[PDB]
Symmetry: C2
């Protein structure tokens, strides 16, 4: 009901900001009891948030806000299958995607778990048939390359897990000689990328779209379908294309065998769909189902930890509260996702959609316009890549709270005889230093003490007191990748739960889709019927005229592929 | 003085209230305003009519540029003055693409003949290399090239390389060849760079000015071990070259010193792709003529930026507009949104170019700024980013967007019977999204469409959110050079108005110092068994947990990935 910014716990945290402004992390980081209290741990995940602009009292006052906002109740209702997505009247049950085969999680009055595992066992049987070569192509060759066609949550989630599993030794062994590519952009350049160095006779296409009507995905689906027909004949569509969708009619009218359709559900948001057939099917073809099952079990272990653990030990709750503290009370509009792992190269782009599409909202869940701004701007590059890109601003420009992620055991250990440190040790040297560099800074007195010229000390001053948090993971196999994914999925839910918004709808995408259909009609009328440009403002009319002024080089209505 | 204390700054501050009394859905109906708020140079058309501004706002930003002596600073850069006052260095990335008979002095010596001496050396080497006469140890012609480097040695070339990969001309000249980048010190990146490569058909280019860069040289010694383990120690001079000015270490590394290619201290790292940093590897992949057209594209913008009046000056307009969005409208972030899959790696480069240049806290004289400068830059290509975070840009925090579209497609595709071509489907979003952000959708429109009253708040688009649109005629090497030079000069303009030094980077020093300290502690504990000493309680624990897992291979023994 009432806006969270109207409660006393919210106002109490606002007054608490003035006291924290009086503090500096250079002094706070010497307190052994403060540092030890501001940690959390679960299995192979160690969270150290001692470098936040906070004391234990700040965490205490954040817990009371979570109670006033009814955080625990909102969590339980999600797990129990209630339709907490109010604006769409949908359950929010991506946790059921990795629940064990015995659990009971109702939605619309029916337990969804036995049907979640029905698709898993169907994926497993297909993947075993596919990987053992019994699934053959039109020319009689076993398919070894898989293209997954999809946009948004059908792309970023799966791409993240695929990139992280690529260089893990056990996963990479199972994916020997197999490629998995993603065709996401409707830009025809992406189609040329997806099919480069590929043989239609040894390629399988997985079209991912709940509706099977998605404009971008279906145009690519029809495009690569013709690519298959152009080389193998019209009958090769059934043995070379499969679908992750529920519209069985369009799937068959597309030319795909309806039994080759793998279903997910409306209580599976796009940005929470990697654990569904959206991700499990392509990943089980590349790495096998045992590997993806370990990934699901990792995310499942965090779902239990998030649902049952007390708040002082609850890692996703701690993370979500500290982000609200940084965003809504310290005033930091952006957040940097900085994993020191090339395997996590595609983590930040997925967190980008997961966070901003969930929490980039302007009204509460009940439709009251928020007097404050919610979801932060999320970006990131892996260390040390991003370290040599934008850390200059993070140290001396605008303040950006940082998520540092480090892994103890290297996926691909390297050491050369005579080196001071192993390659992974050299990488982690920065993982340990940068958070301390942000917290302490370097005073002008330290600089003048080091005989630095007075005209340079202002330029070499580091103010410090800039917040960070550090994940230390035991390893990065399928299990730990699932844990990291679930941690962020729940953290974003916690932030949206505290802000009192709806983290699970996405109405902000419709207006751009509407106007795009209006432009598409204008393009068709001009290209095919020679109609003038009409119905647009003077700017759009001019830009459309410049675009359409370049006529095609291809004969009228004639197919062209790269 | 300080730009925030001038009347031109204060007059623009009050002007914000007048613009806040307008809405873009009304301003976009003015044909006079829309036509005046444009600019054009060759195949580059800039439409900024969707900025929260009028021609009067632009007139007042011009008077801020005059009070900031913008034209003075630009001339001093082009002329070769050491405007990088904190490092006492010229700023002459424009000289990398100047013609042979150009006159650009630093310390009274014309640097242009030395720029072309390297360029001529690159061309002669690239012809001998691509012709196959340059052979490996086993006598095989070299097919694949790995460029080792970090920061500006990585992002710039990656951007240009990714844009050229799918250009029809460039891709033809790069057939059968690979160009990979090894940037992360994470040994997972080493494993990926050498994945499915043969040392006998691989050339390595080490890009590091001093040849002392910690991450680059460890990767450089690592890939050197990979080569010598397969071909012998003698093969180094035949498979490895360098972009460096430290001739002693190049010869000590094993590389023939005459295979070292120079660049200079007045070339910023984030400004170095037009030097041998980029020109050398790109010429190996695409041939020198393709790269010279790229350089000629950047050169065309340099002349335009240096000579054109401010109302036709595309980089000056862009810099003043971003300063307007940042320092007066209060928008702390900027979205780079190219509707081109070929520009996939554009936003990561702009990220470093902008944030490392302008993420500053003090003026060029050493005065601490009472405002904040450099904005936070991020982006994904359309339509990828469209289906990721556009939810927030429409309904959450306001983020000024840069839209980049291309009239002609690098890879045109059309299927018979389709309503629009694949590229037209892409561009429909390019034209629609800026209008969607400008117009919004009022709750009166939604009620007029029989939307339930409870959902009206959630489907409302406030509109009046700013964007600008680039429309390029094509995306060949020439236009890629133009786009690069535009963003380099725009970033300089913003730093000139703010009165900061866009060309030093002291903010990266504290992290490298404390990383060296952690490197010492790691060696002392790995090789000498020393305890953890000299760190705060948090870093001590993190370090203790990390070192608790011991190397899994014999002492001081070489291990390579895969």
């Amino acid at each position: 009901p009432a806006l969270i910014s109207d409660t006393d716990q919210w106002k109490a945290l606002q007054a608490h900001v003035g006291a924290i402004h009086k503090t500096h992390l250079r002094d706070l980081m010497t307190d052994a009891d403060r540092c030890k209290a501001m940690t959390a741990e679960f299995e192979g995940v160690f969270l150290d948030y001692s470098r936040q602009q906070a004391t234990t009292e700040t965490v205490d006052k954040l817990f009371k806000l979570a109670e006033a906002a009814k955080l625990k109740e909102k969590i339980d209702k999600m797990f129990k299958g209630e339709k907490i997505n109010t604006t769409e009247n949908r359950s929010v049950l991506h946790v059921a995607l990795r629940a064990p085969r015995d659990a009971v999680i109702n939605s619309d009055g029916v337990n969804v778990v036995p049907e979640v595992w029905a698709v898993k066992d169907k994926i497993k049987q297909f993947s075993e048939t596919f990987r053992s070569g019994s699934w053959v192509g039109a020319t009689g060759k076993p398919l070894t390359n898989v293209v997954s066609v999809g946009i948004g949550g059908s792309f970023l989630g799966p791409l993240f897990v695929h990139t992280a599993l690529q260089t893990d030794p056990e996963a990479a062994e199972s994916a020997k000689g197999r490629q998995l590519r993603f065709l996401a952009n409707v830009d025809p350049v992406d189609v040329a990328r997806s099919i480069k160095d590929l043989d239609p006779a040894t390629t399988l296409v997985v079209v991912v779209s709940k509706t099977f009507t998605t404009a971008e995905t279906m145009l690519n689906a029809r495009t690569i379908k013709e690519w298959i027909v152009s080389s193998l004949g019209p009958q090769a569509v059934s043995k070379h294309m499969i679908a992750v969708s529920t519209n069985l009619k369009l799937v068959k009218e597309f030319g795909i065998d309806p039994n080759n359709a793998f279903a997910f559900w409306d209580w599976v948001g796009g940005r929470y769909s990697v654990c569904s057939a959206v991700g499990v099917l392509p990943l089980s073809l590349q790495y096998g189902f045992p590997i993806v099952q370990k990934f699901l079990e990792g995310a499942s272990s965090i779902d239990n930890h998030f649902h049952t653990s007390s708040f002082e030990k609850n890692i996703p709750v701690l993370l979500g509260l500290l982000s609200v503290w940084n965003v809504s009370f310290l005033g930091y509009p952006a957040r940097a996702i900085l994993p020191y792992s090339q395997a996590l190269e595609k983590l930040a782009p997925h967190i980008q959609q997961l966070s901003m599409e969930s929490n980039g909202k302007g009204v509460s869940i009940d439709g009251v316009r928020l007097p404050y701004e919610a979801g932060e701007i999320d970006f990131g590059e892996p260390g040390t890549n991003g370290q040599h890109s934008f850390y200059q601003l993070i140290h001396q420009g605008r303040v950006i709270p940082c998520d540092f992620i480090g892994v103890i055991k290297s996926q691909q250990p390297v050491y050369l005889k005579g080196e001071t440190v192993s390659n992974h040790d050299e990488l982690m040297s920065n993982f340990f230093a940068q958070p301390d560099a942000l917290a302490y800074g370097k005073t002008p007195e330290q600089l003048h003490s080091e005989k630095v010229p007075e005209n340079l000390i202002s330029h070499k001053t580091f103010q410090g007191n800039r917040p960070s948090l550090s994940f230390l993971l035991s390893s990065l196999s399928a299990y730990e990748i699932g844990q990291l994914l679930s941690i962020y999925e729940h953290r974003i839910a916690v932030q949206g739960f505290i802000w009192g918004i709806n983290s699970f709808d996405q109405w902000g995408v419709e207006l751009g889709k509407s106007l795009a259909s209006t432009v598409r009609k204008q393009l068709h009328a001009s290209r095919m019927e020679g109609k003038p440009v009409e119905g647009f403002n003077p700017s759009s009319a001019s830009l459309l005229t410049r675009f359409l002024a370049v006529k095609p080089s291809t004969p009228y209505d004639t197919t062209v592929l790269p």
